[PDB]
């Protein structure tokens, strides 16, 4: 549209299990505060997955908290142009008609 400046922006929503999901909402299975905030990210290691599985006990409790993140992108526009000049004597007395 006309009256909205020169920039367009959008959102992108990162999935839950990704390395790009950096946050501070993590609570591990024991209940302690942890830094990662996502279960195990993009890890294929069996040990890492086992150490970070979301297990539950009989009593439940306040464990296994997660969080989310989104990203934004942008782009803009520019202007270009060029020109040339001539005179009438360049047209009338030239040997080649149809130069223009």
């Amino acid at each position: 549209p006309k009256h909205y400046g020169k920039t367009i922006k959008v959102y992108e929503y990162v999935p839950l299990l990704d390395d790009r999901n950096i946050n501070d909402q993590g609570i591990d299975a024991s209940g302690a505060t942890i830094v990662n905030g996502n279960l195990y990210g993009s890890s294929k290691d069996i040990g890492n997955i086992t150490s970070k599985l979301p297990l539950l006990t009989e009593n439940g409790g306040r464990v296994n908290r997660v969080g989310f993140t989104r990203i934004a992108r942008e782009g803009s526009i520019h202007k270009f142009g060029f020109f040339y000049e001539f005179t009438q004597e360049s047209i009338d007395f030239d040997s080649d008609d149809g130069l223009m």
């Binding site: 790009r20 946050n23 909402q25 969080g67 989310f68 993140t69 989104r70 934004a72």
Partner: protein
């Protein structure tokens, strides 16, 4: 917890990461404030002569 915090004054929301930020942070009425004309006193007194 997911908090709104204050995106203005430099405290990003919890949902937003390092790259992102809120798009809309205010509302715009689009009805401007204008000032009217000043009234005139000496002008109605005069009469006109053609030239």
């Amino acid at each position: 917890m997911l908090n709104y915090n204050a995106p203005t004054d430099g405290q990003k929301s919890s949902i937003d990461g390092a790259n992102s930020d809120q798009m809309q942070t205010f509302f715009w009425l689009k009805k401007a404030i204008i000032t009217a004309r000043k009234e005139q006193y000496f002008m109605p007194l005069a009469s006109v002569t053609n030239m």
